[PDB]
């Protein structure tokens, strides 16, 4: 599913004879399609307001893609992740080009770091870091230093044949 897309969502309670024209809550949702996004919305509004999707309705669904979708940027992202024996808040800072692509990475490594599947990850808020020197993760700050230069040593080489004859080099 990891080919996520940020589907912006607006939902509202069903109209009632007492108070029509309801509150019309809105949310951004990170999901692999329109469908999961629709319910993922319903999961979150299931939390913060007395409403279920049967008693409510989805006024609209739309797609989101970054204004400059090929510009690198730093993301400051909060999340609560359901631990093995509980749950904790969690504040990572990941540097990726697309807002969705950041989550593509984030859901991947959180599953690696603390074995939290896509099931229980609740992104509290994604906050793209608007400038530099305001992040607090060294593994990102080391990408914020100037003239980032380094080699990629020990290059791997795929082989389309099971046999070679060269004792392949590894220089790169």
């Amino acid at each position: 599913m990891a080919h996520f897309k940020e589907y912006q969502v607006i939902g509202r309670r069903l109209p009632t004879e007492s108070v029509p024209e309801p509150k019309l809550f809105r949310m951004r949702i990170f999901a692999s399609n329109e469908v999961i996004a629709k319910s993922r919305y319903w999961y979150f509004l299931q939390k913060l307001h007395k409403v279920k999707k049967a008693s409510g309705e989805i006024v609209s669904i739309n797609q989101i893609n970054e204004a400059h979708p090929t510009k690198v940027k730093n993301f400051g992202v909060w999340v609560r992740y359901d631990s093995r024996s509980g749950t904790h808040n969690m504040y990572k800072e990941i540097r990726d080009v697309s807002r969705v692509a950041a989550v593509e990475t984030l859901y991947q490594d959180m599953a690696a770091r603390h074995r939290a599947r896509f099931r229980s990850i609740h992104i509290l808020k994604v906050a793209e870091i608007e400038k530099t020197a305001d992040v607090k993760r060294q593994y990102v700050k080391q990408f914020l230093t100037k003239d980032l230069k380094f080699p990629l040593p020990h290059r791997v080489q795929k082989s389309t044949k099971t046999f070679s004859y060269k004792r392949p080099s590894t220089f790169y």
């Binding site: 020990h154 080489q157 046999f163 070679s164």
Partner: protein, 197 residues
């Protein structure tokens, strides 16, 4: 492509080498393994011994002369990593082991022929840099195989003779390349360059 290939196992994971050989046998390729003593297994050498002694202890109890024959030669320890690695019980598997010739070191006449390698099973390509690899040339010495020295000088003797072979080859290789460039630039090569050669 070559029906009988002299495969060299220098710096090759024993497991990964086994499969890329397990396949080729069952495709029917004639396979001769050489330089088998100094194959590589992934893990710390000390622990590579422990797992063997655990396997070494494993034997039938009622008659220790008919149980799992714990071979010791580096070629044979690799060979055992081909039994079970290949369906040895059936005749097809038996014919597979028939068409496989594991040969420690470089016995004749394969020395005078090309030692193919396996890109996949290479230690350099597969191991994370800095991880603990282990050569079987020292392990088999540490676990009973007793011919480390004799193969050491024998391989030493072949290498110093082979080096001269290459030294003679390089001399001739130089002259053919020198004549290549000298005869190059000719109009015939001009078609070749345009044509694709």
């Amino acid at each position: 492509v070559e029906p009988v290939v002299v495969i060299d196992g220098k710096g090759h994971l024993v497991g990964r080498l086994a499969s890329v050989v397990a396949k080729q046998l069952l495709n029917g390729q004639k396979i001769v393994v050489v330089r088998a003593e100094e194959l590589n297994i992934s893990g710390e050498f000390f622990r590579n011994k422990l797992k063997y002694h655990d396997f070494l202890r494993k034997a039938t109890a009622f008659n220790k002369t008919r149980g799992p024959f714990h071979f010791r030669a580096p070629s044979r320890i690799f060979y055992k990593a081909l039994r079970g690695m290949v369906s040895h019980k059936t005749a097809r598997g038996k014919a597979a082991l028939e068409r496989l010739k594991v040969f420690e070191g470089i016995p004749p006449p394969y020395d005078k022929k090309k030692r193919v390698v396996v890109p996949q099973a290479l230690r350099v390509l597969r191991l994370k840099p800095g991880r603990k690899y282990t050569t079987l040339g020292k392990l088999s010495t540490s676990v009973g195989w007793k011919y480390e020295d004799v193969v050491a000088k024998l391989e030493a003797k072949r290498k110093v003779s082979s080096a001269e072979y290459y030294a003679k080859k390089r001399a001739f290789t130089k002259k053919v390349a020198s004549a290549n460039a000298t005869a190059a630039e000719s109009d015939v090569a001009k078609q070749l360059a345009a044509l694709g050669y």
